[PDB]
Amino acid sequence: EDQGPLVEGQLGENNELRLTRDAIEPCTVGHRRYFTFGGGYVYFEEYAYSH
Amino acid sequence: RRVSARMLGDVMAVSTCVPVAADNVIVQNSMRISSRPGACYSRPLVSFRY
């Protein structure tokens, strides 16, 4: 809800919100990944948010 | 067009592949890995020149 508490979770596919954080993988050099978010995308580089 | 891609998350990247003539490629007569008995490649090996 608009006034509900903040819940911990992880993003999924097709704007899906997952409540469990278990998609762990070994860190790879030169990381880069686009992820669907709302009507656009979220860009990440070296496992760090970009814009 | 013939391209190679890898999952970049919810989107894919692409790279244009370069062609190679058939005469410039040859398959070896065997796959056997003499350096490691018990290990076998799942695809044949090849030697080629651009």
Short mmCIF file of C-alpha atoms in Angstrom, two decimals:
data_model
loop_
_atom_site.label_atom_id
_atom_site.label_comp_id
_atom_site.label_asym_id
_atom_site.label_seq_id
_atom_site.Cartn_x
_atom_site.Cartn_y
_atom_site.Cartn_z
CA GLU A 1 0.00 0.00 0.00
CA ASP A 2 0.99 3.65 -0.27
CA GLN A 3 1.37 3.77 3.53
CA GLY A 4 2.57 0.18 3.97
CA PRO A 5 5.99 -0.76 5.37
CA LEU A 6 8.97 -1.31 3.09
CA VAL A 7 9.49 -5.01 2.29
CA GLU A 8 12.81 -6.60 1.36
CA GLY A 9 12.97 -8.32 -2.01
CA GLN A 10 14.71 -8.79 -5.33
CA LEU A 11 13.67 -7.86 -8.86
CA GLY A 12 12.52 -10.53 -11.29
CA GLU A 13 11.58 -10.98 -14.93
CA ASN A 14 8.76 -8.99 -16.52
CA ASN A 15 8.63 -6.55 -13.58
CA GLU A 16 8.21 -9.47 -11.16
CA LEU A 17 9.06 -8.80 -7.51
CA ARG A 18 10.62 -11.76 -5.68
CA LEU A 19 10.53 -11.89 -1.88
CA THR A 20 13.53 -14.25 -1.56
CA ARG A 21 17.14 -13.33 -2.40
CA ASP A 22 18.79 -16.55 -3.60
CA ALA A 23 20.03 -15.81 -7.16
CA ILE A 24 23.71 -15.64 -6.21
CA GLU A 25 26.47 -16.16 -8.77
CA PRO A 26 30.25 -15.70 -8.66
CA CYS A 27 31.34 -12.14 -9.36
CA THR A 28 32.64 -11.79 -12.92
CA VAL A 29 34.93 -9.06 -14.23
CA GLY A 30 33.48 -6.53 -16.71
CA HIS A 31 29.94 -7.22 -15.42
CA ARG A 32 27.12 -5.50 -17.38
CA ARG A 33 23.34 -6.20 -17.39
CA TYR A 34 20.08 -4.41 -18.41
CA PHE A 35 17.00 -5.36 -16.29
CA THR A 36 13.36 -4.53 -17.06
CA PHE A 37 11.92 -2.02 -14.59
CA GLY A 38 8.49 -0.48 -15.05
CA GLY A 39 8.14 0.99 -18.52
CA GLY A 40 11.90 1.17 -19.15
CA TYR A 41 15.15 -0.49 -18.12
CA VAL A 42 17.79 -0.13 -15.40
CA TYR A 43 21.44 -0.26 -16.45
CA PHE A 44 24.14 -1.78 -14.23
CA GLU A 45 27.92 -1.88 -14.65
CA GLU A 46 30.34 -3.84 -12.46
CA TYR A 47 27.33 -4.79 -10.31
CA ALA A 48 26.65 -1.07 -9.69
CA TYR A 49 23.53 0.88 -10.62
CA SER A 50 24.00 3.36 -13.47
CA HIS A 51 20.70 5.06 -14.45
CA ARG B 1 22.29 -11.91 -40.32
CA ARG B 2 24.51 -14.51 -38.66
CA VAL B 3 25.43 -13.06 -35.25
CA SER B 4 26.42 -14.27 -31.80
CA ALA B 5 24.63 -13.17 -28.64
CA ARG B 6 24.80 -13.61 -24.89
CA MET B 7 22.15 -12.77 -22.29
CA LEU B 8 22.83 -9.28 -20.91
CA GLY B 9 19.91 -9.72 -18.50
CA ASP B 10 16.51 -8.90 -19.97
CA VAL B 11 18.18 -7.81 -23.25
CA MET B 12 20.76 -9.39 -25.56
CA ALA B 13 23.99 -8.14 -27.09
CA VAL B 14 25.11 -8.93 -30.64
CA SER B 15 28.35 -9.24 -32.61
CA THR B 16 28.68 -9.70 -36.37
CA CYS B 17 30.46 -12.91 -37.37
CA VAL B 18 32.98 -13.02 -40.22
CA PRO B 19 32.49 -15.69 -42.93
CA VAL B 20 35.08 -18.30 -43.87
CA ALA B 21 35.29 -20.32 -47.08
CA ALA B 22 34.79 -24.09 -46.91
CA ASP B 23 38.16 -24.91 -48.52
CA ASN B 24 39.92 -22.99 -45.72
CA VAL B 25 38.58 -25.42 -43.07
CA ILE B 26 39.53 -29.04 -42.36
CA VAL B 27 38.43 -31.56 -39.72
CA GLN B 28 40.98 -33.72 -37.92
CA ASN B 29 40.94 -37.49 -38.33
CA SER B 30 40.60 -38.03 -34.57
CA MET B 31 39.34 -36.32 -31.42
CA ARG B 32 41.38 -38.34 -28.85
CA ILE B 33 42.94 -36.33 -26.01
CA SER B 34 46.21 -38.19 -25.43
CA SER B 35 47.07 -35.84 -22.55
CA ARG B 36 44.03 -36.88 -20.43
CA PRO B 37 42.64 -40.41 -20.79
CA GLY B 38 38.92 -40.66 -20.10
CA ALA B 39 38.17 -37.11 -21.32
CA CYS B 40 36.59 -36.69 -24.76
CA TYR B 41 35.41 -33.57 -26.59
CA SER B 42 31.71 -33.39 -27.42
CA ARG B 43 32.38 -31.81 -30.85
CA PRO B 44 35.15 -32.41 -33.42
CA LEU B 45 38.20 -30.17 -33.59
CA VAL B 46 39.07 -28.01 -36.61
CA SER B 47 41.89 -25.97 -38.15
CA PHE B 48 41.19 -22.96 -40.35
CA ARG B 49 42.59 -19.73 -41.77
CA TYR B 50 40.79 -16.44 -42.29
#
